[PDB]
Chain length 281, copies 3
């Protein structure tokens, strides 16, 4: 199924008829960082399998729901179960839910992810406000926009220089300062590793040379589809490790260690994003 105007419209019509919520904020939460979704008020849960033209996610399994409701007095839609390109989903499958958000009325998209640290100032448990990216799949002919352009949504050749809204980064930092955890908050450039293997020790050393501050396997495809259709983005990485130190010391990362860092910072991140939603202009 192509992520075109007709197919996205049929999905949006179903959601409007089931939900009665017109959201203007969308959220996509990283591994182990979804507790906020469980606290949406006056909420409606819509399994992906029931939405016309949504991608099939049964081979992967696990949760796959759209959740609509209220947070801090604002109307929102959340993806509960994020789609990743290392699972084998196509460009069209990644893009369709973001384009449905657009048709539903979403103007701001808030994103979190788990990432490895490259910059020497970063350690386990830190947060990085993403200010730009290096898209290795895009340079190498696997950009999420390869294919015919869907002109109803945006232009053939997008400019990404303002993909990460500056005012939203400033608001996120302001709230950290107001609650005295600003010493955890950095800014940086995100390298997109297609995955699913963690970057090797020698790949980590290369990324340091290239000006990358963090590395992850998500986020950039959704950012590009959002920017193409005029949705503002805030993206925040939770740092699980420092991959440069691990390479120097012959120490390794694994998914169990990553999830343990997520559980340590989950409550703080939930509170932070609730206040961001509340305070959005």
């Amino acid at each position: 199924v192509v992520a075109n105007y007709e197919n996205a419209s049929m999905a949006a019509d179903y959601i409007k008829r089931v939900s009665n919520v017109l959201p203007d904020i969308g959220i996509i939460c990283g591994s182990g960082l979804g507790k906020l979704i469980e606290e949406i008020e006056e909420r409606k849960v819509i399994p992906y399998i029931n939405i016309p033209n949504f991608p099939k996610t049964t081979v992967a399994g696990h949760v796959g729901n759209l959740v609509l409701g209220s947070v801090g007095g604002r109307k929102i839609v959340a993806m509960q179960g994020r789609l990743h390109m290392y699972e084998g989903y196509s460009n069209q499958e990644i893009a369709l839910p973001i384009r449905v958000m657009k048709l539903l009325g979403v103007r701001v998209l808030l994103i979190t992810n788990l990432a490895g640290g490259i910059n020497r100032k970063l350690k386990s448990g830190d947060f990085v406000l993403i200010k730009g990216h290096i898209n290795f799949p895009g340079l190498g002919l696997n950009n999420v926009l390869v294919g015919p352009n869907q002109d109803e949504f945006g232009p053939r050749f997008p400019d990404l220089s303002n993909a990460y809204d500056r005012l939203l980064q400033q608001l996120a930092l302001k709230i950290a300062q107001e609650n005295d955890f600003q010493d955890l908050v950095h800014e940086g450039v995100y390298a997109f590793n297609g995955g699913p293997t963690y970057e090797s020790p020698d790949e980590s050393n290369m990324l340091l040379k290239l000006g990358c501050d963090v590395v992850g396997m998500s986020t950039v495809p959704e950012v590009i589809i959002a920017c193409h259709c005029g949705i503002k983005v805030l993206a925040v990485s939770l740092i699980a490790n420092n991959s440069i130190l691990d390479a120097e010391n012959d120490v390794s990362i694994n998914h169990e260690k990553v999830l343990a860092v997520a559980e340590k910072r989950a409550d703080l991140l939930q509170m932070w994003f609730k206040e961001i939603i509340t305070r959005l202009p």
Copy 2:
């Protein structure tokens, strides 16, 4: 349809029966740089849709013609409507028209494109003679030659060190000097960005570190197919901007600005390539 000997032969036979031109020069023109094709003499226009085994281009739309005729006393074939890999065309679709050129008798292929400037000496409106390239799709398993080798055309493992003919670069510079616009003419290394998004500000900074002088979304696939089958190449970039300055100043590029630079330099480039064709050995 595979870009094999039998399929290319059926296309070449049709063209010979309609055209009565046996060209030894081929040309592929960049965005907004095709006025020379409109001035081919004693010309025959053959829409792609009518040529056996040519790729289907109706989803994209717009012009798609082969044009054969005479320029400066030489017999030529031009692609009017260039195929780009960011549109979703396969390796086989990109390669078949170049292999048809080979079977028709083409020995030299002349190419122009629009590109972003990386080297600090480059500004809007400059020309770059391409002397080498960095093929990010090729390193990343999206080379135009991935698949079975078509042995009738060339070897399994090509050497690209002479892909950009040195004598043709010298002739192009000589003509610029003869007509006193050599101050516009540089040489440089071309980075292939698969596209369709313009390189991000942080990608631009990375490309500077890696020794790239310009960045574009075309040209390298056709160069590789030509080199594989023994066709000499001259490739010239028209610089639309300097992406490093734009990143430092938080300024952006877009397709409207690119086309405006093309219109400013179109007449000069048309005259330059007419004389190159005339003077080819």
Copy 3:
């Protein structure tokens, strides 16, 4: 055909019924480096075309056999005819033979390849023990593990930091010292060029900047599938040239020159790997 547990099990059952060998060592030999396979003792040759679920290799042609038998008193299985991703084989086709090795009992995989030299200390005829890699296809969304995870074989997110066993590198060096050819033996980082074009002169210069010591078109896909399912790896490159010198001098490489270096070093490499097999713990 997917490289899943059921499909690999049907292949392994056929091999066990034809062969009566339960190997614990697997070998994959590089271009022109397969003489050791011709000397396996008490051997059984099984053409790929006869093995359930093995990939079809007739479009490429040439030899394609599994060979089981004894070397130095050890039970081994060899791939005679290696699959390369530049030929167009999918992730699943590359992975299935390695996963069959796992089910047959293989615990150690020995690999050779032909490669270009990047490090200035490397010259034609040298050997490089591979200690790490830079996987350009993997960073760019063409990792061999893209797709659903086959949980029976390994984890969704593998760690590659110990992919190249340290003790096996030390044993290989010890044997070189015992037979006085240690002056040929280096260690280094392997860059995976998807291919099939040799790295261009400007790509070679980029690879030097990024910390690469050698460049090749094979090996990394098999290493990743082996590491995912717990098989130890030793990988050795035979250096055909120095690509940085060739770029500075405007000199070229080709497949004929590569095979001539392989023939010069074939006998020594055969003896080295026979002793490694004999001495494995």
